[PDB]
Every structure is written in structure tokens, then in C-alpha cells.
């Protein structure tokens, strides 16, 4: 058999990957790059085999020929006798979150406010809200809609990076990896929690997992769910219990991609690795947990219960869905 080479985005992911590699007896080894796009390039060169991707990045990877292998499956909402690995994925709800105290703010008054995004090119942080905003404004000048933002991966001198904070030292402002304080789901929610932004584009789970003691992280440990509201597309504001009726979109779950020629090997190795290190895995929590990283969603989202098999051997367009692919394509016409 062959070893599988995972691609870690940034140094925190690299550290977790190295622990995984050690624990797996080098069945998995690590390549690292500074951004998700550069990891996608390492895979296209054959210098890494695989990584797990948000759906917007799956679109970039899929245009370049890489294929989905296994998808994240989180805790099911409904009763299922199906094993996690065989359960169909349900998608997650992209939402726009504001502070309840910022009382005039709705979907229809977002112009010139400050925004927090997971990163450019990700589903809930970018493709869904900016695709909606382009469409509703009739303008491609989405870089002039919010007065200032943190949108990791944008030009660091531009308004879209003005709120990003970089690392402990203030280096790497706006880089699209976990070194940037406001990167990703939890970074973008922290950007709103600290009132750096007026609105965060994240998903429903983010708000629940970082409030009401669900996180003990310093910035999160005192946040209360009732101090947030979701913005609905009809201009109303709801409590964060109502995400099923006040979301922007339903997103396809993050998923592992690989070259087509290494997908079956990558699949087999991952099914075995999650049996050792997954939720209830033989060696988790004793030795290593693949789907934990103290809330920082490194390599995989912390709320992943397993990686699940895909039905229909889907192409990337099948896995993302036609409507979403079409939405991304429309937005990318602007740049």
C-alpha cells in the first residue's frame, strides 16, 4: 500500500497533521502550504494527495479535476439507525449574525456596515452572501459594499482586509489560514463577538458552539446566545434558535478531495484512520482525536462525527449541486 500525504493549511494545521502522522505510524504524512489554494496546487502536482475543503474550495479544486472522496457528517438532527459512515449528509445553514444590541440592522441595511467573513471563496462566508448582494444591488462592485471588512484572502491593503488582525505579532494580516485571528468560522464569529464587525457570515453551528459555555475559549466563554440575532432575507431579525427559517442558504458539507487516480486509496486509508481516531475511535481520546482541535476546526470541523461515503460516485458538480455551482459561476463573473 502507499502512504497518504495530507495537505495542511498553515502551521497550526501542520502541527495537528504531524501528530496524526506520528500516531498513524506514517500511514498518513504531511505537506503544508500557506493557503487552501496552494494546497489544491500541491495536490494537482502530485506532491500531496488530499485535504478536506469547504464547498467554495471544492468548486476551485473540481474545476481543476480533483474529485470528492468522503464528506463530513455531523450529528444528525433526526433519528437514524444508519451508521454515520452510511448516512446521507444534510448540509449546513449559512447565516448572517449580528448583535441583538445593534438594533436597526437588518439584511436591507447592510450597505456601509462592517463585515466579518470566513474567507474569500468559502460558501457561507463569501459565495452565498456576496452572490446575494451582487444580485440584489445589480453591481459587481462587492468590494465597495461594506465600509470595512475582514475577508481573509483579499488584498491586505484593501477595505476587505481592514478589520483583519493577523497573528499574535500582527504578522500575516488577512492571510486565509488559522494564523489570522478572524479566519474561518470561529474567527469570523469572534470578529462579530468583539464588535470589530457589525455582521458575521458563518453557519448556524458556529453560533451555538461558541456561546453559553459551549466554548471555554477566552473570547467566547462569556458570550450568550440571546445577545445575537440572525438576519433573514425578508428583512426580519430572528433569535438564533430559528436558523431553519432565517438562513441565506443550505451549503454542501465540507468534504475530502483528491486526484481522481488516488481517490480509492485515499478513501480506504481515511475509513481506517477514523476507525482509530474518529469520534468513539479506538484511540480517541486516549492517543489522538482526528476531529478535535480545541474549537479551531483544524483539518476537519470539530463538530464532525465521521467522514461519510458519498452516494452516486458524484462529480464535484453533482456533490455541490447545480444551483450552487451556477451561483458561484455567476459571482465569479465579477472578478
Amino acid at each position: 500500500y502507499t502512504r497518504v500525504v495530507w495537505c495542511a493549511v498553515g502551521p497550526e494545521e501542520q502541527k495537528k497533521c504531524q501528530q496524526w502522522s506520528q500516531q498513524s505510524g506514517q500511514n498518513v504524512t504531511c505537506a503544508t502550504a500557506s493557503t487552501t489554494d496552494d494546497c489544491i496546487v500541491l495536490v494537482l502536482k502530485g506532491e500531496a494527495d488530499a485535504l478536506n475543503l469547504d464547498g467554495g474550495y471544492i468548486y476551485t479544486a473540481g474545476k481543476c479535476g480533483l474529485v470528492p472522496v468522503l464528506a463530513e457528517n455531523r450529528k444528525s438532527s433526526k433519528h437514524s439507525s444508519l451508521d454515520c459512515v452510511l448516512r446521507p449528509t444534510e448540509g449546513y445553514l449559512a447565516v448572517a449574525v449580528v448583535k441583538k444590541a445593534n438594533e436597526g440592522l437588518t439584511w436591507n441595511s447592510l450597505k456601509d456596515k462592517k463585515s466579518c467573513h470566513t474567507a474569500v471563496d468559502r460558501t457561507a462566508g463569501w459565495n452565498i452572501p456576496m452572490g446575494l448582494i451582487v444580485n440584489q444591488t445589480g453591481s459587481c462592485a462587492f468590494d465597495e459594499f461594506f465600509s470595512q471588512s475582514c475577508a481573509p484572502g483579499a488584498d491586505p491593503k484593501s477595505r476587505l482586509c481592514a478589520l483583519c488582525a493577523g497573528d499574535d505579532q500582527g504578522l500575516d494580516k488577512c492571510v486565509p489560514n488559522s494564523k489570522e485571528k478572524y479566519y474561518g468560522y470561529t474567527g469570523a464569529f469572534r470578529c462579530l463577538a468583539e464588535d470589530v464587525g457589525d455582521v458575521a457570515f458563518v453557519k448556524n453551528d458556529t453560533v451555538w458552539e461558541n456561546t453559553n459555555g459551549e466554548s471555554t475559549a477566552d473570547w467566547a466563554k462569556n458570550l450568550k446566545r440571546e445577545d445575537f440575532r440572525l438576519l433573514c432575507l425578508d428583512g426580519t431579525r430572528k433569535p438564533v434558535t430559528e436558523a431553519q427559517s432565517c438562513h441565506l442558504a443550505v451549503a454542501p458539507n465540507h468534504a475530502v478531495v483528491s486526484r481522481s487516480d488516488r481517490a480509492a486509496h485515499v478513501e480506504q486509508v481515511l475509513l481506517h484512520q477514523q476507525a482509530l481516531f474518529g469520534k468513539n475511535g479506538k484511540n480517541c481520546p486516549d492517543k489522538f482525536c482526528l476531529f478535535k482541535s480545541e474549537t479551531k476546526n483544524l483539518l476537519f470541523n470539530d463538530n464532525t462525527e465521521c467522514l461519510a461515503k458519498l452516494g452516486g460516485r458524484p462529480t464535484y458538480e453533482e456533490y455541490l449541486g447545480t444551483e450552487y455551482v451556477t451561483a458561484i459561476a455567476n459571482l465569479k463573473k465579477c472578478s
Binding site: 489554494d37 489544491i40 496546487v41 494537482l44 474545476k63 481543476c64 479535476g65 459561476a329 465569479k332
Partner: peptide, 6 residues
Amino acid sequence: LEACAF
């Protein structure tokens, strides 16, 4: 809506 971006 066609080629690889790299």
C-alpha cells in the same frame, strides 16, 4: 465557468 484557475 470552464478552465482550472491555475
